[PDB]
From a paper:
Collagen prolyl 4‐hydroxylase (C‐P4H) catalyzes the 4‐hydroxylation of Y‐prolines of the XYG‐repeat of procollagen. The α‐subunit provides the N‐terminal dimerization domain, the middle peptide‐substrate–binding ([name]) domain, and the C‐terminal catalytic (CAT) domain. There are three isoforms of the α‐subunit, complexed with a β‐subunit that is protein disulfide isomerase, forming C‐P4H I‐III. The [name] domain of the α‐subunit binds proline‐rich peptides, but its function with respect to the prolyl hydroxylation mechanism is unknown.
In addition, it is shown here by crystallographic binding studies that the POG‐PAG‐POG peptide (with 4‐hydroxyprolines at Y‐positions 2 and 8) also adopts the PxGP mode of binding to [name]‐I as well as to [name]‐II. Calorimetric binding studies show that the affinities of these peptides are lower for [name]‐I than for [name]‐II, with, respectively, K D values of about 70 μM for [name]‐I and 20 μM for [name]‐II.
Residue numbers in the entry:
A (entry chain E): 4 to 8
B (entry chain A): 143 to 245
C-alpha cells in the first residue's frame, strides 16, 4: 500500500 | 495560456480530489517543469512530487512512481509517506529479484 496526500 | 506553477498545482489538486489521476499527472508535471525552470512560487517541489508519485502509482507505472519517490526523498529525506512508499517498492523489487535468482 503506497500512501498519497 | 500562461498558468503559474501554483495554478497548475491547484488544478492538479482538483484532479486528484476527483480521482482523475491522468490529469493529476499532467498538471503536476507542468507545475514541476515550471519550478525546475526557476519560476518563483510558494508551492514546493516536495508537495508536487507527493501528488505526482501517487497519481503515477494509480496509473500502474510502478517504475516511474519509484523514481518520483526517490526524487522526493532527495529533497526531504524524512518525509514519512515517501519513506513508507520506498520500503514498499523495495520489497516488491527484492521479491522480483529473488524470483529471478531461483529461475
Ligand atoms: Mg501516465
Amino acid at each position: 500500500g503506497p500512501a498519497g496526500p | 495560456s500562461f498558468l503559474t506553477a501554483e495554478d497548475c498545482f491547484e488544478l492538479g489538486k482538483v484532479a486528484y480530489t476527483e480521482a482523475d489521476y491522468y490529469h493529476t499527472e499532467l498538471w503536476m508535471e507542468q507545475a514541476l517543469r515550471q519550478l525546475d525552470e526557476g519560476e518563483i512560487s510558494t508551492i514546493d517541489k516536495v508537495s508536487v512530487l507527493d501528488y505526482l508519485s501517487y497519481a503515477v502509482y494509480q496509473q500502474g507505472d510502478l517504475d516511474k512512481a519509484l523514481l518520483l519517490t526517490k526524487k522526493l526523498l532527495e529533497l526531504d529525506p524524512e518525509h514519512q509517506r515517501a519513506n513508507g512508499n520506498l520500503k514498499y517498492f523495495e520489497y516488491i523489487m527484492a521479491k522480483e529479484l529473488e524470483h529471478h535468482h531461483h529461475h
